[PDB]
Amino acid sequence: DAKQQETNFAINFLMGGVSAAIAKTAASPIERVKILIQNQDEMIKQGTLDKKYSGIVDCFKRTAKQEGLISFWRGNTANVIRYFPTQALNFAFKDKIKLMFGFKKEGYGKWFAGNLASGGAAGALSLLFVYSLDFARTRLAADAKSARQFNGLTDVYKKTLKSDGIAGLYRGFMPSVVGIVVYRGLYFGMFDSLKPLFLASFLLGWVVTTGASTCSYPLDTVRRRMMMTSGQAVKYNGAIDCLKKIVASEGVGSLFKGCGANILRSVAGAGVISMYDQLQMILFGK
Ligand SMILES: C=C1[C@@H]2CC[C@H]3[C@]4(C)C[C@H](O[C@@H]5O[C@H](CO)[C@@H](OS(=O)(=O)O)[C@H](OS(=O)(=O)O)[C@H]5OC(=O)CC(C)C)CC(C(=O)O)(C(=O)O)[C@H]4CC[C@]3(C2)[C@H]1O
């Protein structure tokens, strides 16, 4: 029944995309609010933004009043598409990389280092095909009417390639990869430590997710702000250079802009994926 297995894997893959699509679409408005607050200083420099966002509520109000309600899903297609090339790469190469750099968990230290190498390589290899979509997501979520900078998703690609080339599409690759490693190490480290300590299960997952993402957030900020420099006259000479200039100009706190908005996005995604699981449990067997 190899053919039946092939059909099973095919249905599992496609329906997985649907689950991911709904989850990301549901928490899409809060996601754009995060991206707006996070890269507002870049917009102010570019002249796209008039005044700094006073907060999450202020971001919601201004965006809704100036652009509308549908504008909160601007860039969402990138998140929808990104599933298939990611998971295809996931199901193909992730296990081999784990078999290449991994050590049996039954020493913790050697397993920890192995997980970083495996997670880093898998993340980087996936980003080679994926990163362009995340870039377009951020840029579409960023450009606003004061006269939009980009007409659409594919418009981003055309204008970025015409100005910077393929390099412009991969702005902030290094701090993204490092971010993946740091996030993963923090995730697994925190999870195993709090493991011996369902509502309890859901709360546990939220704590680890919040902690790991918060500490690795400055890396995410630098990544997104480097995406903003694509097609612009002035650009940072690296993530470290970007990091240095941010602190010297706006302070350390500027690296954590939109962090709280990101936490809200997390509980929204986790929330709606649980709801859909129950809905899926009723319609389909699994
Ligand atoms: C610098 C940063 C900050 C820290 C690292 C990343 C993630 C958190 C990194 C996170 O990275 C995820 O971490 C998970 C837990 O370790 C890991 O799961 S696990 O391996 O099974 O344990 C995922 O691997 S995967 O094979 O299932 O897909 C991995 O996603 C990827 O590696 C795919 C890449 C295309 C990203 C994915 C992601 C997420 O929020 O979940 C995502 O892309 O949605 C990132 C958001 C952006 C930042 C935020 C990046 O800007």
XYZ file of C-alpha atoms and ligand atoms in Angstrom:
337
model
C 0.000 0.000 0.000
C 2.819 2.387 -0.919
C 0.482 4.411 -3.138
C -1.951 4.749 -0.234
C 0.924 6.018 1.907
C 1.775 8.536 -0.809
C -1.837 9.728 -0.855
C -1.823 9.941 2.944
C 1.345 12.043 2.951
C -0.127 14.244 0.217
C -3.351 14.931 2.122
C -1.387 15.511 5.329
C 0.819 18.039 3.539
C -1.995 20.003 1.877
C -4.295 20.096 4.914
C -1.288 21.156 6.977
C -1.010 24.212 4.754
C -4.651 25.058 5.401
C -4.119 24.842 9.163
C -1.074 27.109 8.918
C -2.891 29.541 6.618
C -5.803 30.062 9.014
C -3.531 30.365 12.056
C -1.385 33.059 10.437
C -4.373 34.863 8.909
C -6.165 35.082 12.259
C -3.236 36.747 14.032
C -2.267 38.779 10.962
C -3.505 42.209 12.152
C -1.575 41.968 15.437
C 1.421 40.813 13.391
C 1.430 43.941 11.222
C 1.062 46.081 14.346
C 4.220 44.404 15.647
C 6.088 45.126 12.410
C 4.870 48.738 12.394
C 5.911 49.470 15.984
C 9.188 47.585 15.546
C 10.346 49.442 12.435
C 8.706 52.826 13.008
C 12.050 54.621 13.297
C 13.022 53.347 9.851
C 9.724 54.679 8.504
C 10.252 58.063 10.165
C 13.647 58.348 8.470
C 12.171 57.304 5.121
C 9.373 59.816 5.678
C 6.694 57.134 5.505
C 5.593 57.803 9.081
C 4.656 61.210 10.495
C 4.795 60.653 14.254
C 6.065 57.770 16.388
C 3.469 55.220 17.495
C 2.473 55.795 21.119
C 1.676 52.105 21.509
C -0.301 49.076 20.357
C -3.685 50.779 20.696
C -2.416 53.895 18.920
C -0.986 51.727 16.136
C -4.334 49.975 15.671
C -6.333 53.222 15.594
C -4.071 55.134 13.194
C -3.666 52.244 10.747
C -7.400 51.498 10.696
C -8.452 55.130 10.253
C -5.932 55.978 7.525
C -5.928 52.767 5.473
C -8.897 50.678 6.585
C -9.634 47.295 8.137
C -8.428 45.062 5.292
C -4.987 46.699 5.390
C -4.197 44.712 8.542
C -3.763 41.632 6.345
C -1.285 43.334 4.011
C 1.516 40.855 3.322
C -0.361 37.793 4.576
C 0.010 35.921 1.268
C 3.738 35.588 1.941
C 2.953 33.768 5.187
C 0.462 31.560 3.341
C 2.875 30.599 0.558
C 5.894 30.146 2.838
C 4.492 26.933 4.347
C 4.947 24.682 1.322
C 8.608 25.339 0.478
C 9.446 25.265 4.192
C 7.734 21.986 5.059
C 8.929 20.372 1.828
C 12.459 21.234 2.927
C 11.530 20.224 6.473
C 10.324 16.749 5.508
C 13.292 16.306 3.168
C 16.492 17.423 4.878
C 15.827 18.233 8.551
C 16.141 14.610 9.692
C 19.396 14.059 7.796
C 20.931 17.150 9.394
C 19.825 15.852 12.796
C 21.540 12.559 11.963
C 24.644 14.488 10.912
C 25.261 16.859 13.835
C 23.190 15.161 16.527
C 24.128 13.209 19.641
C 21.842 10.853 21.576
C 20.133 12.585 24.501
C 20.602 9.542 26.740
C 25.063 13.780 27.721
C 22.821 16.839 27.871
C 25.653 19.231 27.042
C 26.681 17.366 23.904
C 23.025 17.027 22.905
C 22.514 20.750 23.469
C 25.370 21.713 21.148
C 24.142 19.163 18.614
C 20.661 20.683 18.639
C 22.079 24.134 17.914
C 24.085 22.917 14.925
C 21.144 20.891 13.619
C 18.633 23.686 14.174
C 20.973 26.296 12.733
C 21.808 24.325 9.602
C 18.175 23.391 8.972
C 17.070 26.979 9.538
C 19.766 28.433 7.291
C 19.201 25.858 4.539
C 15.468 26.566 4.626
C 16.008 30.334 4.632
C 17.993 29.982 1.394
C 14.676 29.419 -0.387
C 12.380 31.027 2.179
C 13.910 34.339 3.326
C 12.603 36.274 0.311
C 9.007 35.684 1.411
C 9.579 36.940 4.963
C 11.291 40.021 3.535
C 8.317 40.850 1.304
C 6.009 40.249 4.274
C 7.789 42.851 6.399
C 8.090 45.430 3.610
C 4.405 45.128 2.700
C 3.447 45.452 6.358
C 5.704 48.499 6.641
C 4.888 50.769 3.692
C 1.945 53.036 4.471
C 0.127 56.022 2.990
C 1.218 59.408 4.341
C 1.194 57.174 -1.564
C 2.349 53.602 -0.948
C 5.906 52.530 -1.756
C 4.909 49.110 -3.101
C 1.913 48.140 -5.237
C 1.891 44.534 -4.049
C 3.834 41.373 -3.228
C 5.455 40.929 -6.635
C 5.985 44.686 -6.887
C 8.351 44.416 -3.919
C 10.463 41.873 -5.807
C 10.678 43.996 -8.966
C 11.646 47.243 -7.238
C 14.065 45.614 -4.784
C 15.881 43.673 -7.512
C 16.064 46.758 -9.728
C 17.666 48.787 -6.936
C 19.790 46.392 -4.874
C 19.549 43.086 -6.729
C 19.297 39.684 -5.060
C 21.233 41.037 -2.070
C 18.352 43.359 -1.209
C 15.996 40.406 -0.831
C 18.327 38.754 1.678
C 18.888 41.655 4.078
C 19.489 40.497 7.642
C 20.263 36.861 6.888
C 23.047 36.553 9.472
C 21.133 37.907 12.486
C 18.181 35.743 11.413
C 20.229 32.532 11.465
C 21.854 33.463 14.778
C 18.357 34.319 15.974
C 17.159 30.823 15.082
C 20.022 29.252 17.037
C 19.555 31.476 20.096
C 15.773 31.018 20.062
C 16.137 27.243 19.758
C 18.762 26.942 22.488
C 16.684 29.088 24.818
C 13.519 27.184 23.899
C 14.866 23.677 24.548
C 16.908 24.788 27.553
C 13.964 26.482 29.243
C 11.533 23.707 28.284
C 13.603 20.839 29.698
C 14.333 22.747 32.908
C 10.645 23.468 33.532
C 9.536 20.070 32.206
C 9.365 18.175 35.527
C 7.268 21.013 36.992
C -4.275 20.697 29.141
C -4.211 24.081 30.884
C -0.859 23.439 32.562
C 0.599 22.182 29.281
C -0.657 25.213 27.349
C 0.636 27.624 29.996
C 3.995 25.834 29.960
C 4.314 26.215 26.197
C 3.411 29.898 26.372
C 6.034 30.658 29.026
C 8.876 29.005 27.106
C 7.790 30.617 23.829
C 7.558 34.058 25.436
C 10.948 33.803 27.137
C 12.945 32.426 24.212
C 11.477 34.898 21.714
C 11.907 37.897 24.020
C 15.622 37.349 24.608
C 16.230 36.710 20.906
C 14.048 39.676 19.941
C 16.855 42.246 19.472
C 18.186 39.974 16.721
C 14.732 40.001 15.121
C 14.559 43.796 15.327
C 17.931 44.209 13.607
C 16.850 41.738 10.920
C 13.641 43.620 10.117
C 15.316 47.035 10.278
C 17.928 45.781 7.809
C 15.057 44.765 5.529
C 13.849 48.365 5.725
C 17.175 49.653 4.405
C 16.740 47.723 1.158
C 16.343 50.199 -1.690
C 17.270 53.056 0.628
C 20.245 55.386 0.210
C 21.785 54.650 3.607
C 22.327 51.105 4.882
C 23.920 49.578 7.983
C 27.319 47.920 7.586
C 26.124 44.709 9.219
C 23.886 43.585 12.074
C 26.544 44.537 14.618
C 26.895 47.947 12.977
C 23.106 48.193 12.980
C 22.994 47.142 16.635
C 25.619 49.728 17.607
C 23.884 52.600 15.801
C 20.472 51.735 17.267
C 21.721 51.788 20.860
C 23.744 54.968 20.333
C 20.818 56.789 18.718
C 17.674 55.445 20.382
C 18.913 53.292 23.257
C 18.734 49.592 24.099
C 14.971 49.747 24.617
C 14.480 50.495 20.922
C 15.514 46.898 20.228
C 12.429 45.704 22.092
C 9.838 47.686 20.132
C 6.876 45.446 19.353
C 7.991 42.690 21.714
C 4.755 42.874 23.692
C 2.784 42.940 20.453
C 4.636 39.771 19.462
C 3.604 38.010 22.670
C -0.030 38.858 21.931
C 0.484 37.458 18.432
C 1.778 34.219 19.955
C -1.265 33.595 22.157
C -3.506 34.485 19.216
C -1.831 31.944 16.944
C -1.770 29.253 19.622
C -5.377 30.068 20.479
C -6.816 29.848 16.968
C -4.844 26.708 16.097
C -6.367 24.964 19.120
C -9.864 26.079 18.121
C -9.333 24.852 14.561
C -8.030 21.531 15.880
C -11.366 20.997 17.619
C -13.196 22.025 14.443
C -10.984 19.684 12.428
C -11.640 16.916 14.954
C -15.363 17.172 14.211
C -15.299 17.367 10.410
C -12.384 15.007 9.769
C -11.239 12.013 11.804
C -7.910 13.614 12.685
C 15.933 36.642 14.790
C 14.718 36.129 14.843
C 13.965 35.911 16.110
C 14.336 34.557 16.683
C 14.285 33.448 15.627
C 13.194 33.556 14.546
C 12.066 32.528 14.757
C 11.508 32.584 16.177
C 12.713 31.167 14.555
C 11.691 30.042 14.549
O 12.391 28.823 14.329
C 11.597 27.664 14.565
O 11.942 27.122 15.839
C 11.211 25.937 16.157
C 11.540 25.508 17.582
O 12.960 25.394 17.733
C 11.565 24.847 15.155
O 10.820 23.665 15.438
S 11.552 22.335 15.675
O 12.780 22.299 14.851
O 10.670 21.212 15.287
O 11.908 22.214 17.106
C 11.243 25.309 13.741
O 11.733 24.343 12.815
S 10.795 23.726 11.769
O 11.529 22.689 11.011
O 9.634 23.112 12.452
O 10.322 24.778 10.841
C 11.887 26.660 13.454
O 11.389 27.185 12.226
C 12.403 27.211 11.183
O 13.578 27.118 11.493
C 11.996 27.364 9.737
C 12.632 28.622 9.159
C 12.117 28.895 7.750
C 12.399 29.825 10.064
C 10.697 30.267 13.415
C 9.968 31.599 13.533
C 8.917 31.476 14.618
O 8.486 32.480 15.227
O 8.481 30.331 14.868
C 9.249 31.827 12.231
O 9.934 31.969 11.195
O 8.000 31.863 12.230
C 11.008 32.735 13.667
C 10.432 34.146 13.744
C 11.530 35.129 13.370
C 12.754 35.011 14.277
C 12.552 35.766 15.589
C 13.951 35.701 13.638
O 13.523 36.841 12.890
